[PDB]
């Protein structure tokens, strides 16, 4: 029951030997999951706070683990004042580890008791302490309370600014201290002041770690506080082109990818032009891959429509579509596919066949090596094939023709993926049945001796695309299919799935 279990846990708590006490304390959250009754939760947390107050630091650490795990059941605490009052008493202990565990406790309880001003004062006083563990615990609790309280955030932003600008604060503590600022999204002037501070940080502390941490937390802050998003985008592009460090450029790429994933509509034509200039200019294929991933993400959205005939984006995507590296080629041809399926200008008519032959080249490139990266690039290219045949249906005959001519020579995994692509294309337009049906059928003969692993899935996919191609009755062809199944499958699950597709 509930009461019985709580009594057993309290008996374990009073045991006075540390092993049973720790066992009982860490047993508490499972009890909460068993019986989420608010009277039980309140009484149990009261007992936990009481053992927290009087008990060695390892027991307090177990209690901290419980409170971190049972964050949702904190909402069902009624005697909040008494609970926090006896948790808070151990902040006066002269033992810095006890203070550290207490600060982390208050950080775990920031959700239920923000705006408890004595707790704020404890975070603020413990921030400038001497013990390193106490300062880190104060930093963690400050992060939580800044996420919760607006008053605490505005009160602590000045302390953090003077702490970074302070000189007795070492570099690693500064590094841990910066990303408190990502929680200054409660107010416009608060966010603007935090932005000013972050600009001062990157100019005055130009080390790789500190610029990375600062410009990444500035990105998150501007992401939450939507007013600062365009200047954040232009700062990231500026750092991508100017800062020579590969780590800084990689961060600029990753967090611009974050911004393009969440607010693509706020991207301007100037930002996309600047990013395209960066991509054309860079000699490093990893950077080119990264910002081309950003470009493909943008091109998936409406940002291309906002971007708009020939331009640096188009020149980029044509140039990178035939790149030696497979990933750059995959992303560039995805960009081409998105631009082609978006607009219907008269210059785009020349662009579509460029895209088609790019997809052709990707099939020739990625259909042999069978590497997992090859599977990724092949999936990107085939999804692009499906996209521009569905969106530009007058261009599907050539797509299917190159798929047919390539299906003979591709490996088994590439055959599975191309059969899936071809099945999608065939499902979306019916005017190509008998011919391509015969070619896939003459392909079907040689499937009995391909391999041992992918043979079954290849048979399923090939029979599926055979059925999609077909629109009539077949007798000798069904005899060939059945003979193949009896000869090589002898499994049934493949036969059942093939029969499912036939139905």
């Amino acid at each position: 029951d509930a009461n019985s279990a709580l009594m057993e846990l309290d008996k374990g708590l009073r045991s006075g030997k540390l092993g049973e006490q720790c066992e009982a304390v860490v047993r508490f959250p499972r009890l909460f999951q068993k019986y989420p009754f608010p009277i039980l939760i309140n009484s149990a947390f009261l007992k936990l706070a009481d053992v927290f107050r009087v008990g060695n630091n390892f027991l307090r650490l177990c209690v901290l683990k419980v409170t971190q795990q049972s964050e949702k059941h904190l909402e069902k605490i009624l005697n909040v004042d008494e609970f926090v009052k006896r948790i808070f008493s151990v902040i006066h202990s002269n033992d810095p580890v006890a203070r550290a565990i207490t600060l982390r406790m208050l950080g775990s309880l920031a959700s239920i008791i923000p705006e408890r001003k004595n707790a704020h004062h404890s975070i603020r006083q413990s921030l400038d302490s001497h013990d390193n563990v106490e300062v880190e615990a104060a930093v963690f609790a400050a992060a939580n309370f800044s996420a919760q309280s607006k008053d605490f955030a505005v009160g602590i932003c000045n302390k953090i600014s003077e702490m970074i600008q302070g000189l007795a604060t070492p570099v690693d503590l500064k590094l841990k201290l910066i990303p408190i600022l990502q929680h200054m999204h409660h107010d416009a002037i608060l966010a603007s002041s935090a932005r000013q501070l972050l600009q001062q940080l990157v100019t005055s502390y130009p080390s790789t770690k500190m610029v990375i941490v600062s410009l990444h937390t500035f990105t998150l802050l501007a992401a939450s506080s939507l007013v600062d998003t365009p200047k954040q985008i232009q700062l990231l592009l500026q750092y991508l082109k100017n800062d020579p460090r590969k780590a800084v450029k990689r961060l600029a790429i990753q967090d611009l990818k974050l911004l393009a994933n969440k607010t693509p509509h706020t991207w301007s034509r100037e930002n996309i032009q600047a990013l395209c200039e960066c991509a054309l200019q860079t000699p490093y294929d990893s950077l080119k891959l990264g910002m081309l991933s950003v470009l493909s993400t943008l091109s998936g959205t409406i940002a291309i429509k906002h971007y708009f005939r020939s331009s640096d984006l188009v020149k980029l995507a044509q140039e990178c579509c035939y790149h030696n590296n497979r990933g750059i080629a995959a992303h560039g041809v995805r960009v081409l596919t998105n631009i082609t399926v978006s607009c219907q200008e008269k210059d785009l008519l020349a662009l579509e066949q460029d895209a088609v032959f790019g997809l052709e080249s990707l099939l020739v490139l990625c259909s042999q090596d069978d590497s997992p990266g090859a599977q990724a690039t092949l999936k990107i290219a085939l999804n692009c094939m499906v996209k521009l045949a569905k969106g530009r249906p007058h261009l599907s005959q050539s797509v299917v023709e190159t798929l047919l001519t390539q299906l003979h020579s591709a490996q088994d995994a590439a055959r599975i993926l191309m059969c899936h692509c071809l099945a999608a294309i065939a499902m979306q337009l019916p005017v190509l049945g008998d011919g391509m049906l015969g070619d896939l059928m003459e392909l079907y003969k040689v499937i009995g001796r391909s391999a041992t692993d992918k043979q079954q899935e290849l048979l399923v996919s090939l029979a599926t695309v055979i059925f999609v191609a077909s629109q009539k009755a077949l007798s000798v062809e069904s005899k060939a299919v059945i003979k193949q199944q009896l000869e090589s499958v002898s499994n049934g699950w493949t036969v059942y799935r093939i029969a499912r597709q036939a139905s």
Binding site: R53, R86, S89, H92, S93, N94, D95, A98
Partner: peptide
């Protein structure tokens, strides 16, 4: 108690 300064704020249960 060794863990609390003598001038610390006393805890009243």
């Amino acid at each position: 108690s060794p863990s609390y300064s003598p001038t610390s704020p006393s805890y009243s249960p």
